[model samples]
Every structure is written in C-alpha cells, then in structure tokens.
Target chain A: CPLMVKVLDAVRGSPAINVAVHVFRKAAWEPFASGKTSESGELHGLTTEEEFVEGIYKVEIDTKSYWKALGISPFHEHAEVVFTANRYTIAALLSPYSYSTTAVVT
Target chain B: CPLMVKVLDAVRGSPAINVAVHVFRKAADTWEPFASGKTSESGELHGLTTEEEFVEGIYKVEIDTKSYWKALGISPFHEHAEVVFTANDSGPRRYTIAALLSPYSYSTTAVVTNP
Candidate 1:
C-alpha cells in the first residue's frame, strides 16, 4: 500500500503557514509501510484520508540532506525520525532545525 | 538598541521550522514602534527578549531571495516579504500567495496577512 507525507512551514509576521505534502506508499519496506512528507508537512491518517486500510509503516528520514545543500551543515544529531504507523492518525513533519518537530495520528 | 527579525519554515518528517531573523530598526517609515521578528519566528514582543523599551519601526522581508538562490532552483517569486509591527502585541505577518515565487526579486504588500 502507498503512504503520504507532508512538510509544514510558517511565515514571519504572517499567519499563513506553508505546507508541502507528498503521497506514496513504502515499496521496499513492506508489511511495515512508510511514505515521504509533504511541503505543508501534513499527511492523511491511515484511516480516512488514505484509500486502503492498515499498513504498518515506519520512517527513515534524511533531515541533513535538505540543509546540507544550502552550503551550511550543522551538527545535526537528530537525523532520521522513525515512527510506527497507526490508522486514524493524521501526521505532520516540519523542516529546518528550528521547525523540526513531529506529530502523531489521533 | 537593535531590533530582531525572523523567518519561520517547517521541515519535513520532523518538527522543525527554518527560522531566519534579521535585527535592525525600521529606517525610513516610523512614528509607530516596529521591530522585525527573529529566527524561531518568535519575537520578544514589548517585554523580555528585546533590548530597550520600544522603537517605532517597520519591516520589509525578502522571501524568494532565499529559495531562488537554491542550487535546485524551483520557483522564482519566493523572495521579498514585508510586515508592519504592533508593540503591545507580538504581531506577525505570514506569507500568502500561490507563490509565483521569485527568489531573485519579488514584492508583496507591506500591509500584513494577519497582524
């Protein structure tokens, strides 16, 4: 089954936050499903927002990859963020060291 | 005292927003105390985190400038974001628009999205 991913960002002095979302299911890592995050950092839960049913998904992210291209690489201890997926949960993953945070499905 | 400015951008697969802040008092336009937001996109407001009591200053931001410079090079109208200030209230102005984004040169209304 395919999964979804999203990336969220907020604007300064403005209320509008930027959201980038990507959709796809784990191909290699099966049984335990997985997907990439989007621009707004919003992902449809395995329950409703998704098409299929349940797929135990886990994540392995490349946080450093994003900033490294910017020509500046900091000592980012926290790189890959792994989480076991659960239905009925809407997940969100944000970017930038400052905005780096996670959310689980409810 | 020098004021601060900030830019907030969230990361993917993580809980982090890229915040870039600039510190400076509003030059040309004044009469109303204004200070730009800081990284973490969180400002000190009229309280702590700030140096002096208050200074009337306005803000002008360049958004696309950051992205347009990217080696990947996606959109263009991503630079130049501006916002007004409110002392008592820690005011913020988020970016709005489909993003015809121009990282080299772009312009937006200084009025505010949600002041």
Candidate 2:
C-alpha cells in the first residue's frame, strides 16, 4: 500500500472504528479517495503505489462526525493534515476535543 | 512557556526520554533550522526559542521516537515523528504538542491557548 492510516480513540484506548478518511491532493476540495476504518482502526487499499506519487496532500478525518456518532461533542469541524508525502503512513489518535497526527514512512 | 511537548511511551505507560527533538521554521519554500534538544526525564524540553523568536510561521517539530525505542531494544516503525503547524498569526498562542508512541504507530495532538 502506498498510503496507510491508523486511527485510535485515545479515551477508549482502542482502535477508532468506522471513522471516514478522505484524501485530497494539493488544495483540491474533492478527495482522490475515501474509505472507512476497519476494526483495527486501519484503512488500506484506498490508494495504490502506482497512483500515489510525490506531492502534497490534505488528509482529512471526519472527526466531528465520528464523535457525534459516539454522542460526544467535538471541538473542530474536522482534523486535517497537509504535507508532502513520498510514502507516508498516517498515525492518528483522536479524542472529542483533541487529535494528533504523525507521518510515518514504511 | 510559549511551547510545550509531552511524549509518552504507550506500551510502558511512562514518559519517553532521551528522544532527539528538532524544530524548523518554514522560510519561503524551504525549512530553516530553528531549535534542537533531547527530551529530559519529564519528556519535555522548554525554552528552546523565546517569544521574540517564535514569530508567525509554519513550524515543524521532529521527534526521534524510533531511536528512543531502539535504545530500549524494541523495534519501531515510522522513522521519526513530525508535527507541523502554523502559529502566532492572531497574537501569541501557547502550544502544547503531545505524542503517544507504540511499537508500530505514534499519534500526535496539539493544544493551543491564549498567551
């Protein structure tokens, strides 16, 4: 996989399931791809190595929706990350009012 | 403190120490080196840059958690951890950037407050 995502629920100390991930290239509003996290809090196959090239990206997590589904109020409308990715795997830990993002290369 | 960083070793449930930390400020299209240090016993290094030096800009903090794990004989993933954000745009804001480290993954979060 060219791009991978691992999202955890910090409060629950478990993988964040069903969280939607939308990825866009550069400043584009439309996502190149989208998917939901599995039970492991991981998403794969949303992208392939051939298509994911060297460029900037906006990896948006529908954090507010995830929190609202859990009956919790969140602070941000969404958690967003913008950076250059060669072969990056995003690791995110999310709470109602807080979330963290780190880019990891495999 | 204008900025604070808290790093935890999730597997051990304790503060992660001795990790190399470096900060860079984006200039035009390149990153200019700004600050660097190693984590103390408390998993933090303060006062790397004064209020006067922390101008409004995009900043990236690189946390060397892989080496921190390797020192403990644990194999890790994600060569290192990087947190980047824009700050001080609307006046000075105190920032606390935190990260949780495990063997295969790491997560980062930020808390911004009024100065």
Candidate 3:
C-alpha cells in the first residue's frame, strides 16, 4: 500500500506550496521516498522502491530552508513524524514556527 | 508596575516588525478592557498593561497580523492569534512576555524574573 501526504499552511489556511517532504524506511539515514509539495501541497500515492511493508517509518519536512526562502521566522523549525502503518495516510499542518501531524488508516 | 513584551521573528533573528497587540481582562461573557498598541522598532511593548489596573486575575491577549501579511504580500492561513495567562499581585511588580513569530505561526513564553 502507498501513503498519501498533505501539508497545509496553518496561518493562510491554504496548501503549503512546494515544501519538501522526505520519507524514510525504518532507521535508514537515507530517504526511501522524497518529494516536494504540489500547488495544492499534496504528495499522493508515495511508495518506496522496495515493497511497502508494515513497519516504522519516518517523515520529515525541510522547514528551515523553506521558511528562510520565504523570509518568515521559524521558532520551531524542525518536525519529525514517525509512524507505524498497517494502513497509512498523513495530513500535516506546517508553518514557519509550528507543526501538527495526523495519520490515518485507509 | 507593568508588563514588558517583546515579539521576535523566528526565522530572521530580528524584531517582528509592526505587529498589533491587544490586551484584555478576561470576563465571564465577553473579554473587556481591550487595550491596543503596536510593537516598537525593537519589537517591544514597554508597558503592555499596568499592574494596578490589570489586577490579579486571568487575562487574554490578541495579536493581529493582517497588515503584516498584507505588507509581505502573502495570504495568511491564520488571521490572528490568542493567548491567555494569569496575573498576580503578590510577586514581582513587572513581568516579561516573549513572543516568537513567523508569517504562519507563533509561540509565547512568560518570565517573572525581574521587576
């Protein structure tokens, strides 16, 4: 099964455009999956080159550079999302200063 | 005798420019005593509220960034932010409220270290 991820800008209440997202397989330093947000701030049907399995995975946002490029201050610039997926989906809120994440089963 | 507030931009390591802050005394039905002002060049509000009039109780704070977003030419996902805190007459005569801000998010911390 593949995972779908979405990032929203909390303050503007809109899709957080072009933000970078990376997904890592259990304990791997390198990303198994990586991509940037679309105009709608979504990454759908993301899967690793290897078979998607039931295990722990990590998701991270490149918040520092993103906020820096936009000239916004980021108090909390790092967000790491870890989850175990039998069924998986992610909807996250990202701002220059804060972050919130939720996972869903589908 | 007063509260000192400083607002900073989290990304830039600089003062949060020209943001509006409103202080209100909390009430049962609606918040009252909506005192308002803007941050100074140093991103500080020297006397946000006076100790005597502000009294000992819960207070609410509101921050508006409409003009800030407009100046930045970006659509804000959130229009404003709110904070609630307690004030006591017993301890220090002054307090410090530090706010961290970005275009899309904010955080606040309070310190009662000095008068």
Candidate 4:
C-alpha cells in the first residue's frame, strides 16, 4: 500500500499554480475514502491505488483554488495536510507554487 | 541539498507519539538556512543528509513535544510540512493525528518522502 501526492502553489508572484490534489482515508473519525487530482499529480502511487493501511490513517487536501487561480494569495487558510500511517509507505506532496518529487510503493 | 522530516502525534487514545522536527529554507523571502533534526525519526534518508535542490526551493517543518510527551491532543490541529523544489527531490513528513489535511498537504517518505 502506498500514497504519495504532489501539488504546489505558493505564488507570491507567479510561475505555476494548478495544483488540485485531494485524498482522504479515515475509517473511524470521518473521511471514509476519497481521491482527486489523479492525472499524474499522484495519489496512492499505484498498488491498485488507495494505500497506507497498517493501522491508523488520515490525509486531507485543499490549496485555495490552487492559490486563487494563480493570481497569488498567501495567508494560508486552505492547507491542512496531515499524516499518520503505521507502516506501508505513504507519500503526499503538494506545493502550491514550488516543486519537488519522489515516489515509491512496494 | 534535500529536506524531509516526520514526527506523528494525534492523541485521542494511545498508540504512538514523539515527533519533533524543524527544517527551513527560503532564500529570497526569508528562511535562508535552517535544520533542526538529524538523528533518525526520519529526514531525507540518504547519502549525506538534506535532499532536494535543483533550482527553485523551499521547505518547512514542525511537531509538538512528540505529542505532549506521548500523551495525546485532539480538538486540535497541526502538521504544516510545506513543499517546493524544482526538478530535484524534496521530502518532509510530519503527522499530528486524527490526521488528514492533504489533510491540506505536506511531506512523506520519512519526511524524506515529501518536501
């Protein structure tokens, strides 16, 4: 099981902001199962998708409409991005403007 | 240079907690140089430490007393773990329980998994 998603948009000026990444997995305290922005933006890195199920789990997503449609707004009221997976490999990286990447699932 | 950090703590009952991480790099808006962890809870696993850096860059990190000293904290909210690195490979993961923000967004791969 593996999950690694990436989307960046921290536009003080501009460069690239179209990051739409949404993923969720929480059985007992809400967020049953959800996934969005998966054209290569990444989500669960493929093992048949939806991963990190060894014990506890939770993940959230939202980037202020990819930083208000790339105009640039940085007060940050739309970034939560939590994490908690016992073991199994989980990767989720979302940069609202910048970019960096790594993917592994096995 | 690469950066990724992890420390999970979201106490509602009891399982695991003890996460403390801090890393930073901005170099144009602020946060020029910063690194506050290099033992092995998790942080850019590899060659000589600190990963990610090819062109544009930015990273961040934070967790709380490894979760109030392994006790718990709900009704709560944390886990920043920002990201930004062009072409290279950045990683920074920090989990603070009841989790899910991407649960808005952050890091993975032992923090060495996202940045």
Model 4, position A50: C-alpha lDDT score: 45
DockQ of 2: 0.17
Report the C-alpha lDDT of model 3 over B20-110, residue by residue, as the tens digit: 9888887777788756788899988876656556677677777676566667775654567677878774654566778776566666887
TM-scores across all candidates? 0.31, 0.62, 0.58, 0.30
For candidate 3, what TM-score does chain B get against the true chain B?
0.81
Task: State the lDDT of candidate 1 residue by residue for A1-106, as single tens digits.
Answer: 1344444322222211232222234553443333344444444442244455443344444444544554534345324344444433333232244333354443
- Assess each model's interface with DockQ, reporting 2 decimals per model: 0.11, 0.17, 0.25, 0.05
lDDT of 4 by residue, A1-106 (tens): 3455544332342323334444455564454445554544445432333443553343444554655665664323234344454413333333443222222335
Tell me how candidate 3 scores on lDDT: 0.72
The CA lDDT of each predicted structure is: 0.34, 0.78, 0.72, 0.38
**Alpha-carbon runs more than 4 Å astray in model 4:** A1-19, A22-52, A55-65, A70-72, A75-80, A85-106, B1-21, B26-33, B37-57, B69-115
Write model 4 residue lDDT over B1-115, tens digit each, in one string.
3433333323333322333445455677576545554323331222223334323344444443324443443322222344322223233332121221122222332222233
Instruction: Give model 1's TM-score versus the native structure.
Output: 0.31
| Structure candidate 2, residue pairs in collision | A100-B108, A100-B109
Best candidate, TM-score-wise?
2
Candidate 4, residue A37: Cα displacement in angstroms equals: 7.1
Clashes of each: 77, 2, 10, 53
lDDT of 3 by residue, A3-64 (tens): 77888775565787887888887763456788888998888657852567777888887767
Better by TM-score, candidate 4 or 1: 1
**Tens-digit lDDT track for model 1 on B42-86?**
312112133344433343332323532343333433444543444
